[PDB]
Symmetry: C3
Subunit: 66 residues, 3 copies
């Protein structure tokens, strides 16, 4: 898709206003998407920590039985 820039100064200002509103939206969206990815990675890390802590309890039980 492709449209010529306005030549009229007022029209050009209004187009730039629109592009500023669009860039504000893009910034917010890709911040949210990045937040979501990080929280998924955190959830995966914390599950690993939980599983490893259970293994440690299993190893400690084994040491009792030696």
């Amino acid at each position: 898709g492709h449209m010529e820039p306005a030549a009229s100064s007022q029209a050009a200002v209004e187009e730039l206003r629109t592009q500023v509103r669009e860039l504000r939206s893009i910034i917010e969206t890709m911040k949210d998407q990045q937040k979501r990815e990080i929280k998924q990675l955190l959830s995966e890390l914390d599950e690993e920590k939980k599983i490893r802590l259970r293994l440690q309890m299993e190893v400690n039980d084994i040491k009792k039985a030696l």
Copy 2:
């Protein structure tokens, strides 16, 4: 809060200049905040790796004693 856009072309250009300076700031801020979150997650991961490596040394000691 709400203020009408300037009608004068020069005033409108100067407002858009201001909004561009403000968007540059927002971009930098939310990049830094995202960096900080990632480095905290990395610190948590590396501590886990350290703890797991210690468990491995404990398991290896146990194997000696069998």
Copy 3:
């Protein structure tokens, strides 16, 4: 580096157009860099998970031999 803003309205509009094209580029770049950092952290997490799962298999072998 430092250059005075254009005074002419059309020239000023064209400068602001340029800065909008530059901010679009900065946004994309720092999104990609942030993506790259996250995927490296994910690779490190998944390797840890792999190593821990191997330790669990080693512990389970030890339990057989008790």
